[PDB]
Structure formats: C-alpha cells, structure tokens
Amino acid sequence: HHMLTRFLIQEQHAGRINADLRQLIAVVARACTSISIAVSKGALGGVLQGEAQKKLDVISNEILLEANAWGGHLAACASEEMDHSQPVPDIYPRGDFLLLFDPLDGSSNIDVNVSVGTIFSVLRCPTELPGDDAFLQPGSKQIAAGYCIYGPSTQLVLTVGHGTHAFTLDREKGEFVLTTENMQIPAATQEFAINMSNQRHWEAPMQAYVGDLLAGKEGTRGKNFNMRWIASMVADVHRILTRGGIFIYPWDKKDPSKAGKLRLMYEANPMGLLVEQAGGAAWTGRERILDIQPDQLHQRVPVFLGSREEVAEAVRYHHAHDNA
Amino acid sequence: HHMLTRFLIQEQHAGRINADLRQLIAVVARACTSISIAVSKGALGGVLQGEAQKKLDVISNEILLEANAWGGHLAACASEEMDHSQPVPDIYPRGDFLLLFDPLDGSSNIDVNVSVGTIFSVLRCPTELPGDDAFLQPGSKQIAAGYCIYGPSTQLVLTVGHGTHAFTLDREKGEFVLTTENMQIPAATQEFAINMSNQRHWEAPMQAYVGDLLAGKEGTRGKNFNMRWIASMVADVHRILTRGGIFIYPWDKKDPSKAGKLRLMYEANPMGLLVEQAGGAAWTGRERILDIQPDQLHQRVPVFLGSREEVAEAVRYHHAHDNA
Amino acid sequence: HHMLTRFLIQEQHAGRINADLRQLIAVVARACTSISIAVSKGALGGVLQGEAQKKLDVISNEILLEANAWGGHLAACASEEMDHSQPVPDIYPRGDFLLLFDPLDGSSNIDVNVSVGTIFSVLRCPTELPGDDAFLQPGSKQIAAGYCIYGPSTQLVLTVGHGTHAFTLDREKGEFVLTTENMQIPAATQEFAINMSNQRHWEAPMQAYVGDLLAGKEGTRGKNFNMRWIASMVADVHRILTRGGIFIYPWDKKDPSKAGKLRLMYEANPMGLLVEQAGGAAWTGRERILDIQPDQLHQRVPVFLGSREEVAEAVRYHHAHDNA
Amino acid sequence: HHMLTRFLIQEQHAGRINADLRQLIAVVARACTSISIAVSKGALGGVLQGEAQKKLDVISNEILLEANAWGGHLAACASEEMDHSQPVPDIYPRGDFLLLFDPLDGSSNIDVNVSVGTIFSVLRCPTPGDDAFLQPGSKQIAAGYCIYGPSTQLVLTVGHGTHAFTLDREKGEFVLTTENMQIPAATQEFAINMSNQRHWEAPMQAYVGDLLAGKEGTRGKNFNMRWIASMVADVHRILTRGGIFIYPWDKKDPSKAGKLRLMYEANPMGLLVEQAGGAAWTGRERILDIQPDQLHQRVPVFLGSREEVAEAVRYHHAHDNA
C-alpha cells in the first residue's frame, strides 16, 4: 500500500513540488478527512440542508484559518460560500500560496445520502497582503487541483501537473492510499451527464447537440448514448475520470446575465485541470476553460468536460452555429 | 438513541410482527452491515464490475445460507442473480418465510463511488419444499420489505406494514439507529427521475408526459421541473422518500418483448411497498404494482413511483391514450 | 480468517454443543463487544469508579435481559454485583440455561487504563422457575465458560469442554476471529502472580511456598522466579494461558471468616475450567476447585491456577503442613 | 471537546512553546496513533515477542526519519533499541531538537494483551552526536508517553504541569481528558518487582519489609501493591491516583547501576511525575539533576507520591550514615 504521504515525498524528490506545496496538500487532505468523518455519521453526527452547508463551512473555515500553523504556507484563502477572499492571520507565518476551497459540492444531495464532495485549487501569490485581485489567474496557472468525494468510500483525487491520481481513505488508519495512478479518460464515450430538465432553456447549438445524442444510432452520431445526472459535479466527474464520458452545464436563458451555473475559480478551473491531466478536455462550448483570464472572483462559465473527442464534437456544434 | 434491535422488539410487543420475522430482519440487517463494510473499503478491501457483483453475491449467499442457524426461519431464498430460488439446508430448522434478495442495486455505479444498495422482500410460504412457484405472490402479500443504501452514510429503510422507517448505521457500534420514523412522501413534487437518453424509445403517452415536464411553466403543468438520474434505484427512491419526487422506468421499444427494465419481485414490489407505506403511489403507468399476480420469478414491469399526485398525473396520460 | 460464528457452528456439527448453547454464546459475545466499545472510549464515551462498574452492569443487564429474544435460551441470570439471581422474562421463550456473569473483573483498574475483563459461566438448569439454589453446582458441571479481556486488543477466550480457544475482535468487522486454537499452558513455569502485600496474612505453608520462590536458585527450587500482579484476574490468567505461570489468591487472616477473596461461582470455576481445558490445574491449595459443591451463590474460595506442576508444588506445601 | 491541536496552539500563544516544538509534538502524537492502531489489531494485523518489538522499531524509525518533512525540527534522533543516536537526513530541513524515543515499553506484555507504551523525551541541541544528548533531565523541554490500553492515552508535559489526552478513535485525534494531573503527596500503593527481594541492598529490603508489616510495623498503615511490568502502566496509575514505583539497584548484575535507562525512561517519566507534584529520585539523589555519562546509562528509579519517595530516600540515607 502506497500512502499519500510517501507519494507527496516522492513528488518532492522528483522535483515536481517543493516542501511547502507538499505540506499544504497535507493540510487539505486532513481537512477532507475531517469532513469525511462528519458526513459519514449522517444524522448521528449533527451535521445532518442549508444548515448542513453552514456546518461544513464552519469545519472548513476553522481548519483553514489555522492552516499556516500546520504547514499551509498560505498567503490567502477563498471559500465558495464567501463573497471575498480572507487573509491569513499574522500570528502564524505566511507562505506563497492562494487556496480556493469549495467545502460542499453537490449541496442538494447532502440530505439524501448521495455522494457529495469538496473541490480545491491552489494558485501562487504573485511575487504581500494578497487580496481578491491576486486570485484572478487563468486555470493554467494552477499549481495543484483536486477533489475529495464522500461516497460509499472516501477518495481524494489530485493533480500537481503530472497526471491525475486517485487515493482511497483507509478508515482504520485515517490515511489516504494510492488506488489509481494516472487516471485516463477514454477519448470517446457514449455517456453524457447534463440536466435534461433545462432543455428548453439552452441555446440552439446546445439543443441540436443533445437532440443528436437522443437520436443515437438513428441520427448523425451513429451510436446510442446513455445518461446520468447526479447533481454532484464531483460524482459525475469521478465517473468520467474512471470510465470516460462528458459532463455539461451550459449557459441557459433562465438567468440570461449569468454566463453559466458553475463558478470558474472554484469548480471549472480545478475540475478542468484534473480532467486535462487525465487526457480529457475542458471547454466552455467555444474556448478552453483553463485559458480564460478571470474578471471576478465569482465569475460563472459554461462547462464541457470529459472525453476529449466528445467535447470536441460539442464545441463544433457551437462554432458551426456561430459561423452560420 | 433508538436501536434497531429495540425497535423490532417493540414491533413484536405491539403485535405487528412475531419473533420469527424480527429475527429474520436481524439476519438481513447484519448481512447489509457486512456489505456496507466491504463497499466502504473500496479498492482497499475487496469489492473493487461483474467481479464486484459476484463478490457481493458470495458475501450475501454465505450469510443467507446459514440464516436458519441464527433465526432466519427461511424456507427458501431467491437472489436476483440466480435464475431460480434455492431451498434452505435441512441441517438447520426450517421456517415459514420466503426471502427475495437483490444484493447489488445500481451495479453500473459500483466502481465510481456513487451510492448503491441492497433490496429485500419477505413473503410467507404457503402452508412444504417450496419452489419458484411459491414465490409468485402479489406485492400486497409481502410481510416485510426494505433496502440498505450504501452512501456517505449507510442507511437501512424498512417496512413491516406500519409505515416506512429509516435507520442510520452507527459505525462505531456496528448497529442501526432509528433516524427517521414514519417517512412521508409529499403528495406533489417538482422533481422527476427518469433516464432521458431513452426518450425516443418510449410510447406516446410517456413522451407526452415528459414533454410537458420539460415545458414546465410554459406548458399545461404550470410549474417547472428539475431532474436527477443516478441509475441506482435505491438512491433515487431514497431521495423521494426523503423529499418527494417521481421515479420512472417505463416500457420502451429497445427490447419489445420485455414489459420493462425493473423486476417485479426483486425491485418493484419491495420498493413499491416502502413507497406506499410512506404515502406514495406505485403504478405501472396503468395499474397498481402491488396487485399484479406475477407469472414468473423474473417478470419485468414498468415502474412509476413516488409523490402520489404526480404518479396519478402520469397514469392519466396513459389511460387517456388508451381511450383515444 | 476463522470467524467465531463459523467456529460455533462447527462445534454443533461435531455434537459438542447444541443450537441453543451456540446462540447463547453469541449473545454473550455480542454483549462483550458492546462493553469493549464503551471501555475503548475511556472518558470520552461514558464508562469513565463505582459509577464505571454501574454503567457496565447497566449495559450488561440490558442486553442479557433481552437475551431470550435473540436465542439466549436462559432460565435465569446471576450477576456478581447482585445478591441473588434474576429470572428471565416470561414474555420471551424460556430455555434450559443458567448464566453467571461478572461484567467487570479488575474493577480497581477501570480508571487507570490497565486491561480489565468480563467473566461468564454457563450451567444447565435441572429438569421450573429456577432460583439461587439451582445455581449451586460444581464447576465440573459447567457447559461453557469464558472471559473477554479488554486490553490494547479485545480478545474472547472460551471453552465448551473441548479445549480453550482465543478469538481476537476485528474492530472493522465487529466480529471475533480465531487467533489461538487449543491454548496450552506449559506444565512448568518460572512466573508467579500473587499479591505480595498480603504476605504477613498468609498461613504458614503459603509463606514457605513463596519464601522458596524468592530464594530461587539459592533455595530448594533451583530456579529463579519472576512475578507480576495486575489485580485484574483476567489479565493474569490470560498471561498464563499464553505462556504459563501460576496465579494465587489464597486464604488470608485479614477477614478470617472469609474462605478466600475470589468467588467460586463467578470467578474460580469458569477460570478453572478454561485453565484445565488448557492442560493447567485449578486447586484451592488442598483440593480440586471444580469438584467443590457450593453452599451459597457468593461463596469465596482460595485459588491456585496455572501450570500444573507448579500448582502441584503449591499443593504439596499445604498437604505437608496439614500432615506435620 | 478540547483537541490536542488546539491545546498545543494555546500553549504557543501563552508563550510556553514555539511553533517548532508544537509541530514536533504533533509528529510524535501521530506516530503514537499509528503504533496504537497496529497494537489494537493484535494478531490480526501482523505485529502480534522480539519480532513484535522489531516491527514497532520499524514503524517508529520510519516515521521519525521523515519527521523533518512534517515539522519535526529535529537535529538528531535516539531510539532505545539502537546503540547510538541517528542523524536526521540532509534532504529535509534540520531543526534544534534532540528526540529520544522508546517505541515499546513493557515488552514482556506485548504478547499477552496488557497495556504497553511508548516513552519520549525532547532535549534542545546546543548551537550533533551522542554526546549532544548528554544533558540532565532538568533540561528536557518536553516529555511524555502514550499508553496503549483498553483506551489509548497520551500523557504530556512541556514544563507547565502534566496533561492526559484520550484518543478519539473515530476522529483519529487526541482529546484532553485530564488537565493538571496531580499525584497525592502520600499513598498506600507501591509497585515493585517483589521477586527480586533477595537481591536488593539493605535499606531497600528494610523499606519493603516495613511496607509488608503495615499497621503492625513502623509505618502505621497497610500497603497494597501492583506489578504490571509495563512502566507506563504503573506510572499511569500513579499519575491518576498516587503510589510509588521502584526499580532499584540489585545484585544480579552488580556493574549495572539499575534496570531502567536514565535518558529514555527515568528522565522523561521523572519530569511527568515532578510536573504532577510527585518526586523522582534514585533512592539517594534527584533524578533530573544527574549529569549523564553515557547515552544508555542505567539508574535506580523511585517515582511517585513525594512523601513516600522521601520515606524511601530516608531509609537509604540512614543506612549510608549508619
């Protein structure tokens, strides 16, 4: 059994991460392990709802505002629940990392015992007193991204720029163990995850693309598709990282001013990096997600994730519509 | 702090079950606890896929073949994986119960860390040497039904004909603890669970019904709908038992011979009883599921489950079609 | 590996126990598992003292008062804390067994994190409404005896008259696993367990025996001795079952009325049977413990247990004194 | 619940320890948690005997050789099983701490499911080799043990009292359960290996003889005894409810000044006992003031209720003057 701790040390010896980033990823993994234990207790733990999300915000903020006492090397932190990033305390040393944290992904499933998750992303603080504006970096500047999925088992999935790697929580030991090295997303797929209840709100190339999925063998695609919609992004992506697929949360006309539903800095960029590092693709329908220069901390963006040939197909429907 | 064991003893003192059925439900609860532990280990423990299902068939069949040594009171057992029911060994005392067991519900999710489940149903043996034909009873003759859902928490949901009750596994104690007495499914809902990739294969009233769901506030329904599709029936019904909704797996033309996807005896009937004991409805689109006289052990049937007003609406679409 | 449940089923197939006794031993094992969990939590869980003993009496008497609902087949129960035996409820089926239960052995160690234990003994009820007098049977009439020791690991040690066998609790599974079949106590030893602070109170042969142990190689014994005194009888005897030794709690003059410290029915007889079934000896210093016909349920008796040659030597000192 | 982690952070804000010592105590706590899990599995896990001790030395030396990767701030490490101290790797940053580690205390109990323990001691490296470890016990900046019993408990001092934490097995974290442990000044409980009686020097035999005489002798009260042969377990009882623990000089190996080791056992347990109001003496002098001569020096040990230790010392001083 190859422990996460030995894995991160090997990553330092290979020269892919320094000691500071290894220790920060350790703080996060311990935080996710704490979240895992609370979620695992269900209604017996008191965490089990907007109240469930607030309690995980509490557990997340506590661990992460003491993170520098235990090797976080953080300059600043940004939580999906808060409007602005928060500075690190003066009582502990400051480091050169910006952490973005999504404590509870898949909030509508917290009460109904479907897998939920935590998403995190690590940027570098530009070469002090970092503020909101220091977080506005393209996804390609992430130095680490990952999620922890709380399901029948607890799994940490991470990348530091050299592939995407899955670890399973050994509950007896309280430690993560490497269980899938170098996750690989097959280039093609017959499985799509999209919220089909939003069909009438999508723009035309999006409706044309899905309509062809439905037509299957009887349509231009020549093969039949199947679908899932878990409404935990972490669960849908975890399936895609395991056996391929496409996940889509596109623009829709319900809130026309909103560029999308998922947030660029907290969800699209970290999941996008994991997917690319597993050979997947991560696009808005029209452009590469990781190259967007963010304008605001909480910017929304359409998300097309997964098997790269299928993302390429979906992108083509959009470019062909724009060019018609 | 209300233990499953004490709950069942109260059910006996209340005259709703006898000692034999209480002990069989204890055997089932223990078997689900063991499955829960194996699934919680992920790739570290064993289940981690056809190989995953076979390992769960083995863990289930071992405990269930020694059930009568520990209060099973079983005359015969039928596993969803086996073509035929199996008699219990003569070495241990025989009882008056027929057990239907579905060891792994949601098999396409076993390897991707989404909630899966076990489903079980208890019939009374007619008054010796029962075979497949002794299992062919309408769902209204079930004396017990339930499932165990392996999610971020492990929960056992059960009925013996006096409401539907959810217990959460206390992993420290190894025992189930009552966490929701008298589950109730709201009469109306705005959530549907159906595999929308199969749209082109449905019959017309099914397509008209779903088309109106998609139309939402701009169509005859006057309200917008949201959807999930987890492809673990236990997870979708567990959401409905918690907060309402409708779950549909209808007839489709992909395999025109088959009346449906889900099995009447192993899936529709036990989940149907749980849903009804929580104030929901359980219909084929045209008739009450629990009144069907089964013709074969592995009979398939279309399934419309959940909020009773929404199920009623779906049924109306079909009855109106048959009458036009 | 080899589960306690399967071990007991094999013991039934061999004709050494029936189904009733197997199920009762299961009830006891389950109760010891629950005590084990409470004790493992220390001050965090509840047990942490007379209040500690009372909390264990409560946990024990609760499980044992519903024992016949789960296969206890008990006619009556006697706890060392209670003055008299208690009948089983008429609401549940009555059986043919008398259970003697010592919930907390080594009570002076409960608060200082030294191994403690539970001791139990099973008699058959003579062929209705058994009272204290039905329990007054010689230890040779026990059909089962054992203890559970709560140490750094939890282990159940048991005999049903065919050797003594140790099972280790697998905390992940919640089940006992065979870890030493056919425990054997070496005939000779160099280790003694006695409370040396009571030396001035012992009778003369007892003082000469121990004086010779102290003299070691420079005295008549020709070998040096080492000693322990834990003041948990289960821990001292557990060492003896693992690697030999002698355990002595003799008569003393502090309370001249009292024949000894340990109780014949709750401590001497069950531990004596386990030691004998492991090839050791169990004597009062003058006669075989398991042949004593008890006069009262709480009779005390001196105890010399362990390596049979060493026990024989201790007995010789006393017989030579009585004959001089 | 008050977590060890929050406890250690308050100790830094109070100015009693710095960030380096807090993180090192965290490394040790994690290492003891890992030992605890292995020991809890008994024969089911592997460790359960010299083979048991070696497997625990392996688990211990592995974690401690990467300690500086996780905030050890170690300059060198010394294990009871090894002859000499071991330097820390150059790959990781060096710190200012000397760690002495006793991975398995009470080795004769590892196979028979009686409480065993780990003992540790932290010195500061002067501004490193074996000789750098030769500091009197009064220069320890931290000491403690972890006792693996029915529960797992970490007992610790950093020079401001002695404090017990209980392992919450579900959470994997230590929780404060006895703040400011206090050893009552007097006692009626003694822990000594009575099988060694004929080997003790005269004052030791007279002292024990008077315990046995009890109310019929000069002491005027009756005594009771334990001997667990895990030092951590006997001292843990004393830290909970008083008593005296004695492993004296004896004539079986006359060259050896005692059985227990000064650096790995006597000094750390002595500091915990003193910080709980107890006393820690050789029978003739204060243990924590001894200047060690060698890393593995042995010393007689009299620990616990200070009045009872003082009584034991008086028997010896009177003998040396008679």
Token pair for B155 = 């929960």
Inter-axis angle of helices A269-277 and A233-243, nearest 10? 10
β-pair partners for B97: B74, B124
What is the token pair recorded at B232?
């673990």
Q: Is A36 part of any known ligand binding site?
A: no
User: Would you state the structure tokens that stand for residue D69, as one six-digit string?
Assistant: 């990767």
Q: Which residue has the tokens 């869980």?
A: C45
Structure tokens that stand for A101 in this block: 């944290």
The pair phi, psi for residue A175, each rounded to 5°, is: -130, 150
- DSSP per position, D64-77: HHTGGGGT--EEEE
Chain A interface disruption, residue of D3, D5, D24, most A CBs within 10 A = D5
| Distance from C-alpha of D6 to C-alpha of B97, rounded to nearest angstrom | 55
DSSP A243: H
CB pairs under 8 A between A and B: 151
Chain C residues with beta carbon closer than 8 angstroms to that of A172: 171-172
β-strands A303-306, D74-79: how paired? Answer: unpaired
**Cα B258 to Cα B233, B261, B284, D150, distances in angstroms:** 19, 7, 14, 58
Count of C-beta atoms within a 10 Å radius of residue A12: 18
User: How far is the C-alpha of A210 from the C-alpha of A201, rounded, in Å?
Assistant: 13
> Rounded to a whole number, what is the distance in Å from the CA of C6 to chain B's nearest CA?
9
What is the DSSP track for D140-172? -SEEEEEEESSSEEEEEESSS-EEEEEEETTTT
Coil vs helix vs strand at C262: coil
Interchain proximity A43–B168, CB inside 8 Å = yes
Nearest residue on chain C to B25, alpha-carbon basis: C70
The DSSP secondary structure of D103-122, one letter per residue, reads: EEESGGGTTTT--EEEEEEE
Question: Is residue B228 a contact partner of residue B306, using CB atoms and an 8 Å limit?
Answer: no
Pairing of strands C175-180, C191-194: unpaired
Mind telling me how many Å the CA of B64 is from chain C's nearest CA? 13
The number of helix segments (H) and strand segments (E) in chain B equals 7, 13
Encode C52-76: b = buried (16+ Cβ within 10 Å), e = exposed: bbebbbebbbebbbbbbbbbbbbbb
Phi, psi of D174, rounded to the nearest 5 degrees:
-85, 140
Is-contact C160 C21, C-beta < 8 A? yes
Task: Give the whole-angstrom CA distance, residue A28 versus residue A101.
Answer: 9
Q: Note whether D144 and D105 are within 8 A (CB).
A: no
Of B69, B66, B131, B64, the C-alpha closest to B102 is: B64
Contact status of C10 with chain B (Cβ, < 8 Å): no
Contacts of B171 in chain D (CB under 8 A): 170
d(CA B24, CA D178): 45
Asked if the Cβ–Cβ distance from A179 to B43 is below 8 Å, we say yes
The DSSP output letter for C300 is B
Q: Which residues contact B39 (CB under 8 A, 6 or more apart)?
A: A152, A153, B47, B110, B116, B150
Picking from A195, A212, A290, the residue whose alpha carbon sits closest to that of residue A252 is A195
Q: Which helix (H) or strand (E) holds A62?
A: helix A50-65
Q: How far apart are CA A187 and CA A209, in angstroms?
A: 18
Decide if D185 contacts D306 (C-beta within 8 A). Answer: yes
What is residue C215's three-state secondary structure? helix
Instruction: Decide if A288 contacts A318 (C-beta within 8 A).
Output: no
C-alpha dihedral sign at A239, A241, A244, A247: positive
- Residue labelled with tokens 């703080």: A27
Structure tokens at A296: 């605001």
| Positions of chain breaks in chain B, given as the residue before each break (C to N > 2.5 Å) | 48, 127
- Touching D: which chains, 3+ CB pairs < 8 A? A, B, C
Residues ≥6 apart with Cβ < 8 Å to D286:
D280
DSSP A184-242: ---S--SEEE--GGGGGGS-HHHHHHHHHHHHGGGSTT-S--EEEB-S-HHHHHHHHHH
Q: Is D170 on the interface with B (CB under 8 A)?
A: yes
How many residues are given for chain D? 322
Residue keyed to tokens 């169509």:
B219
Rounded to the nearest 10 degrees, what angle do helices C233-243 and C269-277 cross at? 10
Question: Which of B103, D71, C114, B113 lies closest to A156, judged by CA?
Answer: B113
**Rounded Cα distance, A240 and B83, in Å:** 33
3-state secondary structure of D212: helix
Give B134-195 as a DSSP string: GG---GGG-SEEEEEEESSSEEEEEESSS-EEEEEEETTTTEEEEEESS----S--SEEE--
Write out chain C residues lying below 8 Å of D153, CB-based.
42, 113
Which residues in chain B are closer than 8 Å to C172, comparing Cβ atoms?
Answer: 37
**If we measure between CA atoms, which residue out of A151, A122, A119, A162 comes closest to residue A31?**
A119
DSSP, residue by residue, B196-252: GGGGGGS-HHHHHHHHHHHHGGGSTT-S--EEEB-S-HHHHHHHHHHH--EEEE---
CB atoms within 10 A of CB A82: 14
Residue A269, helix vs strand vs coil: helix
Q: Are strands C191-194 and C226-228 parallel, antiparallel or unpaired?
A: parallel
User: Neighbouring chains of B at 3+ CB pairs within 8 Å?
Assistant: A, C, D
D24: tokens are 């090192």
Residue D169 with chain B: CB contacts under 8 Å: 172
Please enumerate in sequence order all residues whose Cβ is within 8 A of that of C272, keeping only pairs 6 or more positions apart, or say none. C139, C282, C289, C290, C303, C305
Dist CA B191 CA B312 (whole Å) = 15
Sequence letter at residue A241: L
What are the structure tokens assigned to B121, written together? 């149903």
User: In 3-state terms, chain B is what percent helix, strand and coil (to 5)?
Assistant: 40, 25, 35
Neighbours of D127 (CB within 10 A): 6
Tell me the three-class secondary structure of B117-134, residue by residue: EEEEEEEECCCCCCCHHH
The secondary structure of C130-168 as a DSSP string is: --GGGG---GGG-SEEEEEEESSSEEEEEESSS-EEEEE
CA atoms within 13 A on the CB side of C284: 19
Nearest to D294 by CA among D85, D76, D65: D85
Burial of D221 (0-12, 13-18, 19+ CB in 10 A): exposed
Euclidean distance between CA atoms D1 and D14, whole angstroms? 20
State the burial class of residue B129 (Cβ atoms within 10 Å of its Cβ: 0-12, 13-18, 19+).
exposed
Closest-CA distance, D68 to chain A, in angstroms, reads 10
Beta-bridge partners for D167: D174
Q: Would you state the structure tokens that stand for residue C254, as one six-digit string?
A: 């502090």
Distance separating alpha carbons of residues C267 and C294, to the nearest angstrom: 13
D141 token code pair? 């900046």
Measured in angstroms, the resolution is 2.2
Q: Is the dihedral of CA B302, B308, B310, B313 positive or negative?
A: positive
- CA trace torsion D281, D284, D288, D292 (10° rounding): -130
Torsion sign, CA atoms B262, B263, B266, B269: positive
Q: Is residue D60 helix, strand or coil?
A: helix
The alpha-carbon radius of gyration of chain C (Å, integer) is: 19
Residues facing residue B83 across a β-bridge: none
Q: What is the bridge-based pairing of β-strands D224-226 and D189-191? A: parallel
Distance between first and last Cα of chain A: 55
Q: How many residues does chain B have?
A: 324
Q: How far apart are CA D107 and CA D228, in angstroms?
A: 11
Q: Note whether B217 contacts C: Cβ–Cβ < 8 A.
A: no
- C-alpha distances in Å from residue D59, one per residue of B6, D34, D45: 43, 8, 13
Residue of C nearest to D237 (CA): C112
Q: Cβ separation of B173 and C23 shorter than 8 Å? A: no
Query: What's phi and psi for C95, nearest 5 deg?
Result: -125, -160
Greatest CA span in chain C, whole angstroms? 66
- A172 at the D interface (CB within 8 A)? yes
What SS3 state is found at A100?
strand
Instruction: DSSP letter for C267, please.
Output: I
- How far apart, in whole angstroms, are the C-alpha atoms of residue B24 and residue C1? 25
Neighbouring residues of A63: CB distance < 8 A, sequence distance ≥ 6 = A27, A30, A31, A34
Helix (H, G, I), strand (E, B) or coil at A151: coil
Number of H helices, E strands in chain D: 7, 13
Do β-strands D74-79 and D244-247 pair in parallel, antiparallel, or remain unpaired? unpaired
